Design a binder for this molecule. Structure first.
Ligand code: PK4
Ligand code: PK4
Ligand code: NA
Ligand code: NA
Lengths: 330, 330
């Protein structure tokens, strides 16, 4: 039912956006069908975990506060697609960075990214035109864009000096995870579920933001390990954190328990595309028993998650049930 | 005074944004100074015509409706910088398309473009937090982004078939100018001047949008001609409309008054980077007496502008005076 309702609202949102382009933006049918195909290609096919979370939080809050039910669930679907469309946007953005007479393909790719971003605003300004939370919803969506852009600056410049392994620390790793993933992957769907449920002031934002920290930290540590050791066919992509010299969990944990000679060998091989240099970094990670610390680190973070849900349970019981479901997905 | 007040508010907006990053976004001083330099580099140095227009419209409307004066003029400066910051954003975006081990310069350039875009929202959500027009201002700013993105799709795909000179017409040229330049360059500063002056419903939006059409059309026709004939040192850049096969005013006007043999020669040379092929296109433009039609076309459009200002004068006299000043700049 939640997935079935989520897909029906997609056709409703798609038909509005495309008809609006045809009726108000003077768009020819060729470009309309081109945009329908590009919208289906970039927005569909995922798991919709962050779009379905908005629905699960909304339905968990109407069970413990007829016509208002259909409105909140429909608003939560439009909100869920704002998140999926936003993720569809960055999916195309994650291709412009590793792809390179004007090139029309690069021009169309940049344009697709701009359209996917604008569609989130257009669907919100339409379906929420008479909602009292429209202004607050647009403001919180601008803040998550700023947070993500700031998180990218931290992630990209973690090995240089913005006009180098000094920033390869555990607190700076948390800072990157906080602004690049945690606030984006987990806080955004939960907060918007509270907005459409009119139960935003009924929850502790500090406890909610802290839950997103640990859940985003748990997920990013797992991603960093899989990016290094999981083979490409089983991971779904080619792990390149070592070649790109990313400030990963494996890097900052290794630099803490390694000898001076091992750090010198790490610094000499980290950040290169050579096959044996990357293999040298994997050997240094293996010999340092990092996968033993990975189990203890993930268990300790999970312990903090299971206990923080109960603090939020005391004031918002229905909200905590939906956070337990999202936490199960990670 | 208007330029002096506009620059003081810049330091106020810059200091808020940077201190906010330091105090709320956990940014180190190295990256703060890096962002101050990048903000100064991308946002300053222009002519500020579209930022100063907001001030001129605001001051022309308070003269014909103490504490409210200082508020409206300050709000108009923040609004003016939202436009200049937005233009600063596309200045960096106009470099990613013609510029191309992760490349850190391309990553920083994409990040700069995202930050410049987010800064427009952050300065609006801060200085207009208690203004009743904050929601309407954010909505109109989302629509101009959609309009610009749609205008780029029309401009980029004017010679292909979105999954070819058929779209090389005068009405389609106006469609491109409308969404890519007219609504962006001229309607945006005027409307925001009306917002901060609380005089939005007091004007005819249809007459106002129509004025932006003709003024944007007048300016784009002049740009298309200068891009072709004005030498690089006098133009300020290297004109490349012929090589990029742009749907320019010269192209659609030539195709209407040319013979079949001249159109065949045009189609054989248009859209190539060869020196003599581009020179062949310039010769075809010269021999067709296009610069004689350019004078008549610009005069006819200017006649429609001078007469449309008087229709708007009948209901909004102060608004028309500021539109006459902006029209003088073009
Ligand atoms: C305090 N919450 S917020 O600023 O509205 C917000 C919500 C969701 C995600 C982010 C990054 C965010 F900043
Ligand atoms: C009707 N006006 S609008 O939609 O708010 C608007 C204002 C300025 C520029 C653009 C493109 C725009 F669409
Ligand atoms: Na998702
Ligand atoms: Na300007």
């Amino acid at each position: 039912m939640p997935m079935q309702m989520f897909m029906q609202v997609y056709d409703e949102i798609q038909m509005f956006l495309l008809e609006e382009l045809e009726l108000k933006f003077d768009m020819d049918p060729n470009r309309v069908r081109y945009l329908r195909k590009m919208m289906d290609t970039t927005c569909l096919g995922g798991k919709y975990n962050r779009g379905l979370t908005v629905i699960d939080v909304a339905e968990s809050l109407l069970s413990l506060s007829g016509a208002r039910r259909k409105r909140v669930l429909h608003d939560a679907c439009v909100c869920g697609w704002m998140i999926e469309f936003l993720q569809a946007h960055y999916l195309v953005e994650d291709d412009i960075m590793d792809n390179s007479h004007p090139d029309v393909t690069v021009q169309c790719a940049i344009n697709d990214g701009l359209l996917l971003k604008s569609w989130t605003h257009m669907m919100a300004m339409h379906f929420f035109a008479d909602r009292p939370f429209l202004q607050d919803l647009l403001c919180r969506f601008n803040r998550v864009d700023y947070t993500t852009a700031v998180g990218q600056l931290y992630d990209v410049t973690s090995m240089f000096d913005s006009n180098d392994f000094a920033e390869f620390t555990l607190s700076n790793y948390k800072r990157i995870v906080k602004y690049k993933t945690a606030y984006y992957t987990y806080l955004l769907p939960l907060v918007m579920g509270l907005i459409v449920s009119e139960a935003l002031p009924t929850v502790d934002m500090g406890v909610t933001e802290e839950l997103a920290m640990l859940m985003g930290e748990y997920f990013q540590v797992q991603d960093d390990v899989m990016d290094c050791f999981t083979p490409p066919e089983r991971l779904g992509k080619v792990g390149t954190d070592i070649q790109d010299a990313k400030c990963s969990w494996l890097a900052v944990t290794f630099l803490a328990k390694a000898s001076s000679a091992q750090v010198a060998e790490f610094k000499a091989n980290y950040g290169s595309g050579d096959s044996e240099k990357v293999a040298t970094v994997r050997r240094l990670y293996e010999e340092a028993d990092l996968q033993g610390d990975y189990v203890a680190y993930e268990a300790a973070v999970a312990e903090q998650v299971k206990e923080l849900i109960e603090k939020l349970r005391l004031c918002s019981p229905g909200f905590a049930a939906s956070v337990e479901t999202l936490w199960g997905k990670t």
